[PDB]
Amino acid sequence: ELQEKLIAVNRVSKTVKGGRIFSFTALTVVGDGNGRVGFGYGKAREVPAAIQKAMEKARRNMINVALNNGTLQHPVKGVHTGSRVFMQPASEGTGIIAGGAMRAVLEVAGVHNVLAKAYGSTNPINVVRATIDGLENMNSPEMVAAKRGKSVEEILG
Amino acid sequence: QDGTFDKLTKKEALMRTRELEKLENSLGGIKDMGGLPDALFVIDADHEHIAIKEANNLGIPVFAIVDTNSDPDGVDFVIPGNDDAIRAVTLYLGAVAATVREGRS
Amino acid sequence: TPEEKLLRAIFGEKASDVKDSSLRVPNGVSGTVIDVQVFTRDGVEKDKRA
Amino acid sequence: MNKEILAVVEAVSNEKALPREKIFEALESALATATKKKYEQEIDVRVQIDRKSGDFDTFRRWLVVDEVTQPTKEITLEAARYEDESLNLGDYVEDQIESVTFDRITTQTAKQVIVQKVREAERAMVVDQFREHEGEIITGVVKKVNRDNISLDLGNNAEAVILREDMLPRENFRPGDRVRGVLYSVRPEARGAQLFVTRSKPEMLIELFRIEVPEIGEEVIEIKAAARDPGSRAKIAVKTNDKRIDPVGACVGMRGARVQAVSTELGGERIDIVLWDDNPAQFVINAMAPADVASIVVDEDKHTMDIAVEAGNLAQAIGRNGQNVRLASQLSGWELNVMTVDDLQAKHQAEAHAAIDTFTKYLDIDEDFATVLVEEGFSTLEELAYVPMKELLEIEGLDEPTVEALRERAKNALATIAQAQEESLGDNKPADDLLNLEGVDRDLAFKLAARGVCTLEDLAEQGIDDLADIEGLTDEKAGALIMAARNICWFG
RNA sequence: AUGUUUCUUCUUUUUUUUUUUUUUUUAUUUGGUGAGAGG
RNA sequence: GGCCGGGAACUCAAAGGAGACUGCCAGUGAUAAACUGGAGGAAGGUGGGGAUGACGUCAAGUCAUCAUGGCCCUUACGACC
RNA sequence: AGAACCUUACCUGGUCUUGACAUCCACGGAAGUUUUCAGAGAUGAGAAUGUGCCUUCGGGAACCGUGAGACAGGUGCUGCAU
């Protein structure tokens, strides 16, 4: 139902007088496949507890995005801290043609047709934050119609 | 309140009733509730700024008596007015009590 | 039971586990008791009816 | 002997967590009862046990009373005070009596009274400590299966009962089976089964969800309502105050695992979980799941809701034998009428036509004006008679004089209708006029009014022959009533 | 007051895998012999 | 010569309990923690001493206590004097 | 927390190899004991005596040796595999 999805684990560290202690961080993502998607970071001293704590905050972090039929509404930028994702709707683009960490977050969100490419530092946690704000500001024509023009028809013909 | 206030150690029984009354005021009228509240009536936005940030993490519509120094963005039903005079607070507390008595029909 | 061994408390003797029971007789015949004999081996205390 | 009483009191006090005093009071009562049985006469007896030695003195008790009804057990206050001036009403006068030897007979009586005191102390305190269990899902072992009930053993000499109505329709228990159920009532049948356990009532469903869903036990999710057809289907309505939690998703669990655990414990009962809404119409839409609702019409006065569904969904909305609509109605508290969109439109057209016919007939208005009143939402003569004048003045084409005239006509129509029915039967007009004649019961007044005798004058004009066919009216009683009516009408 | 220096050479990395029950033995008073009697 | 009778208080042996807690007074301090002093008490501020060694450090020590993965010898690196 | 031999793992020399220590196989002899020579000792050659336990006694195994291959042995190496 929730269709959870892991992206990348990592081995981070920090040192003390005794030595250095590692842990694990594991960015994951969840999504209903019909417009709800949420990620969550999570970190712990062991990978089973790392990925579970990741999902548990990803359940509460879900956002709604308004799309049409497995693809986006319009072209949209996505900038967040050294990660410029570009997203083009590509009406029946025959699969989600995107890179890693976008292929995850677009799939569980439910789109199936977008063309996308990330410009800049392809860092996984910063790029899944880049698509999210790029998707949540992307707007349906309904929201566009009821702020501007006030006809659902003529705003797109 | 009845029972083990003497049974084993009198000095350590004074420890628990030293533990009690500090917990009595910090967890005051919350122990009668159980679970999360539905709304939240604040009398100073600046001073209690943790809770407004805390309540806006969840879905709780809050009610703040705001003073001119604070920022009225996290509060939904913003109420402007003084909040450092005692006679001012008994207006808002007297109004929110008598109205919610009418709302509990 | 504790109360059976408490015969010593209110009274004395010993314990009450022993089956208290009075030799009662069977049925089939009525009658009227016309004559009672009591013979006593010598040395034994005669009771009040003897 | 002596020290043995103290050792027994200490052992029983420690093992049963019972006050030594309560055990002694009961042993005293047990010994008094055992003493009473050795005498051929009904005597009153007090026993007193010394709390240090275990020695006991037995009396011929004489309940000090004001009026003596039982001279063998009661003494007057005046006679009691002759022996001891300190005695009051309700005290006991004693008499040096030989204490019963503690044989295995008294021993058995003492054991029985101790066991009974433990049932009213140790077991009572255990039930008080298990305040949660008295309400939550207790677990018992089936001791006995009868035709009409199942006896459960809970341990510690506690017996519970499941009644036949409290069982699921397909459950078959055997002696030795473990059974869970909600303790829904504690009565006072200590000897036997004071505990009543249910598996059929809605509380069993609520408490199974409380155990299986941590978010309900933590008060994060609340169950607002539960409706149940035991062993077949249930509906539960859930609410949460935390916008981060889906209450339906939490109760279903990962792939339905939580709801399937509850369903399995209930013998494969189908459980629908619906979102509670504070809007009644939205809550009923949710309760009607899995049927899609097209429209709802709410009648607040009748506390009923008409639910329109697509013709393809009608059978799903009603459910097998009306089970879906009945469970939704029990869950909402509303009476739910499920029909097609076409049937709802036909019903509204028939109601509008009946309202138009009623208004045209009673208000002396044209059909065009009656249609405007129905389009503005007026359906009854009562609404038109009593609604605030402001709402009637908001209707296009109504002036203050026309609204006043319409209200006066509506009130006169309501008055006329009431009077007509009261004269036809015996509601008020014939229940006062025709019933004036002494002897007229309400039934006879309605029988008279069914013959057109509606007033005391109409009855004064009758012959005995005109009333002879009225069931329960003899010629003598008819003659008396006609004469009583004539005395009032013609000679008053 | 100021206090120089610490062979050489160098790592790997965490998403599919699993355990266990059987135990042990279980109304009560009244047999012969000899004599008599009923069918 | 407690050496003999005798004795059970005393020393001691050995069980089981009391007692020391900042409990009391004063003073200072935020009326808080406490701190300094006094009383009493055999013992006064964890009474004196011991056992007890957190996560880790050093791939510190030991494969010659033992056990152990490897590798090596097998008329021999084994076994006896 | 104790090296005259022993301990002792080291050294010279004398020795034996399925072995001083365990399980297994086939044979023969109760096991044990006393005593003599040769030998630095290990050992070698004996010489005498004992000849018990359960029985299917064609026995078997408490026990000593000889032959069989599995194997046994290692205070040999690596604490930076444990």
Swiss-Prot record, chain A:
Changing residue 12 to E: In strain: SPCR7; spectinomycin resistant. Not a ram mutation. Gene3D superfamilies: 3.30.160.20, 3.30.230.10. It holds the Pfam family Ribosomal_S5_C. One of its GO terms (cellular component) is cytoplasm. Residues 2-65 form the S5 DRBM domain. It comes from the Bacteria. The keyword Transcription does not apply. One of its GO terms (biological process) is cytoplasmic translation. Disulfide bonds: none annotated. Changing residue 11 to L: In strain: SPCR9; spectinomycin resistant. Not a ram mutation. InterPro entries: Ribosomal_Su5_D2-typ_SF (IPR020568), Ribosomal_uS5 (IPR000851), Ribosomal_uS5_bac-type (IPR005712), Ribosomal_uS5_C (IPR005324), Ribosomal_uS5_N (IPR013810), Ribosomal_uS5_N_CS (IPR018192), Ribsml_uS5_D2-typ_fold_subgr (IPR014721). Keywords: Acetylation, Antibiotic resistance, Ribonucleoprotein, Ribosomal protein, RNA-binding, rRNA-binding. One of its GO terms (molecular function) is structural constituent of ribosome. Signal peptide: none annotated. Changing residue 103 to G: In strain: NEA-314; neamycin resistant. The keyword RNA-binding applies. Part of the 30S ribosomal subunit. Contacts proteins uS4 and uS8. With proteins uS4 and uS5 encircles the mRNA as it enters the ribosome, which may play a role in mRNA helicase processivity. Can be cross-linked to mRNA. In collided ribosomes contacts ribosome rescue factor SmrB. Belongs to the universal ribosomal protein uS5 family. PANTHER family: MITOCHONDRIAL RIBOSOMAL PROTEIN S5. Altered uS5 proteins have been identified in a number of mutants. Some mutations in uS5 have been shown to increase translational error frequencies. Some mutants in this protein can partially suppress an alanyl-tRNA synthetase mutant.
Curated annotation (Swiss-Prot), chain B:
Required for ribosomal protein bS1 (rpsA) to bind to the 30S subunit. Belongs to the universal ribosomal protein uS2 family. It comes from Escherichia coli (strain K12). Part of the 30S ribosomal subunit, contacts bS1. Some nascent polypeptide chains are able to cross-link to this protein in situ. In collided ribosomes contacts ribosome rescue factor SmrB. It comes from the Bacteria. This is Small ribosomal subunit protein uS2.
From Swiss-Prot, chain C:
Acetylated on several lysine residues in the presence of glucose. Co-administration of salinamide and rifampicin or salinamide and myxopyronin suppresses the emergence of resistance to both antibiotics. Belongs to the RNA polymerase beta chain family. DNA-dependent RNA polymerase (RNAP) catalyzes the transcription of DNA into RNA using the four ribonucleoside triphosphates as substrates. Resistance to the antibiotics salinamide A, salinamide B, rifampicin, streptolydigin, CBR703, myxopyronin, and lipiarmycin can result from mutations in this protein. The RNAP catalytic core consists of 2 alpha, 1 beta, 1 beta' and 1 omega subunit. When a sigma factor is associated with the core the holoenzyme is formed, which can initiate transcription. The rRNA transcription and antitermination complex (rrnTAC) consists of RNAP, NusA, NusB, NusE (rpsJ), NusG, SubB, ribosomal protein S4, DNA and precursor rRNA; S4 is more flexible than other subunits. In pull-down experiments interacts with CedA. (Microbial infection) Interacts (via flap domain) with Escherichia phage lambda antitermination protein Q; this interaction renders bacterial RNAP resistant to transcription pausing and allows it to read through termination signals. The gene is rpoB. The chain holds residues 896 to 945 of 1342 of the full protein.
From Swiss-Prot, chain D:
Residues 230-293, 302-368 form the KH domain. Residues 364-489 are annotated as: 2 X 51 AA approximate repeats. Disruption phenotype: Mutants are sensitive to DNA-damaging agents. Pfam families: HHH_5, KH_5, NusA_N, S1. Residues 345-426 are annotated as: Acidic repeat 1 (AR1). Keywords: Cytoplasm, Host-virus interaction, Repeat, Ribosome biogenesis, RNA-binding, Stress response, Transcription, Transcription antitermination, Transcription regulation, Transcription termination. It is found in: Cytoplasm. GO terms for cellular component: cytosol; transcription elongation factor complex. Monomer. Binds directly to the core enzyme of the DNA-dependent RNA polymerase (RNAP). Interacts with nascent RNA. Interacts with the termination Rho factor. Interacts with the phage lambda N protein. Interacts with SuhB via the AR2 domain, crystallizes as a 2:1 SuhB:NusA heterotrimer. The rRNA transcription and antitermination complex (rrnTAC) consists of RNAP, NusA, NusB, NusE (rpsJ), NusG, SubB, ribosomal protein S4, DNA and precursor rRNA; S4 is more flexible than other subunits. NusG and the alpha-CTD of RNAP interact with the AR2 domain. (Microbial infection) Interacts (via N-terminus and AR2 domain) with Escherichia phage lambda antitermination protein Q; this interaction (AR2 domain) releases the autoinhibition of NusA. Belongs to the NusA family. This is Transcription termination/antitermination protein NusA. The lineage of its organism: Bacteria, Pseudomonadati, Pseudomonadota, Gammaproteobacteria, Enterobacterales.
